[PDB]
Amino acid sequence: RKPQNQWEGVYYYSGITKRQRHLILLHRKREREAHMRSFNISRASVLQRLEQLSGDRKQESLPPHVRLDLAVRLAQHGLYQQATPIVDELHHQKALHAGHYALLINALACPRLGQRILHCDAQCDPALTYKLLGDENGEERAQEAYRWFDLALTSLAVDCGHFVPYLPQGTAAASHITNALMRTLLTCGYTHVAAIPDSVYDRMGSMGISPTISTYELVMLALSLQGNMVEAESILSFLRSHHSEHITVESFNALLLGHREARQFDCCDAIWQELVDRRWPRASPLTAELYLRSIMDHANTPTSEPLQSFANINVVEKKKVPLVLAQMDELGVPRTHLSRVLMDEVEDSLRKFQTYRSRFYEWGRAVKQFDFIEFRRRNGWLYDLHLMKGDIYYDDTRGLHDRSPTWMNEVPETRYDRLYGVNHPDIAKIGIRRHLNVEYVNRKEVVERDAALMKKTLSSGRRLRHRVESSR
């Protein structure tokens, strides 16, 4: 029988229909419309709230907390220009305090516009949200964040009016506003996220403000977005040496994000395996999102030294996805807290690399194998990548023939059968009888039949020799 290929994989169904990929694209466009509809309804509500309190309260002065509540809601929805006359009169009336300034600068980073950018524009990539928030007035919001920081430190000197030459730089309010400044500057452009570890951090050191754990995590996230990993791991190495009790999850989230931008996928594996090992701080769904997206960027990355001679090699990195999802079940990370863009690619890796025991008993049936061949024969133009087009270290002088008796042990049956007539002058050296040298099962019976054929041929040849010359 013709042999079957043992290095050919079993035919199994790993893929989706053209209707299903269209229906995934159609359903994902509906919820992108739903988040676009949800933002503009609430944006129009805060703009109607602004014009109501400006028109009907034209001469009646509002209480300062209502104007403070509307100023943070304007800044959260990306409307920074409608909020700066509100904060300028609240600072002039001296109604703002230490916590109020940190509330306004944290609102200036717009955590309502970033929610629309995440679900609709950035395709649920948490690294791309910082890259896309910098375009909607990134330099303009950074100047007002620097201006409100100068408004804050001027107010803190009034609010602190012993430790008198070391106020307000030694208080908790100075670092809280400085942590609010670095959080707002991360949402700005590339010129301002580069100024966080260099310009803002040295200004905090020159002012003598003691940092906190949220200070270092935003600096590590700022160095993560630049792509500088030799400095980002050094800050956590300072935190691993000195302040190890206060390390939260966001330092690990910066390093998982940072090696994803630098495309060092071997490093981001070791950070995830470290977080599974220590199990403290707890793995957020942002940890599972940043690590699984680094797998998919590594899986869709083409290689160029074999130049894809047979297939894509990096697609084997999606086999780790059932291992990571099994680790999320024990870490307490719910897999339903994953984004819709990532969950389609996670289930893409699951139907390609996962099988159950009930399916493994039925996946090799000849009916399913021959359906795979006919479906490749009928429509292979729709789903194909090709159709689109002693001890040796102390040995040096070896001791040979150490009188080890091979006659105490018994291996007596090593008889070998060679072909008849090797040195015979009548038998030729080359011939088709040379193929008898490669035969193992019938080695004894073939060469004794071959010797009996060659002995009778040389006997009949030499008896024909003696008959012809004796007759003439």
């Binding site: 297939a311 084997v316 099988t355 159950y356």
Partner: protein
């Protein structure tokens, strides 16, 4: 060379053979709750012990 047959399969050829065949989900064998002392041997008759 004229007859070079490698005695080690290359890293590209190993990665192709691993990427073509799927994994079995019961090979992870993780367990954190414990053994069902009352129900696991008395489950439904098709998938029973």
């Amino acid at each position: 060379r004229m007859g070079y047959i490698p005695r080690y399969t290359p890293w590209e050829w190993i990665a192709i053979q691993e990427a073509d065949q799927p994994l079995i989900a019961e090979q992870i064998r993780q367990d954190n709750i414990g053994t069902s002392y009352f129900f696991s041997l008395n489950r439904y008759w098709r998938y029973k012990a």
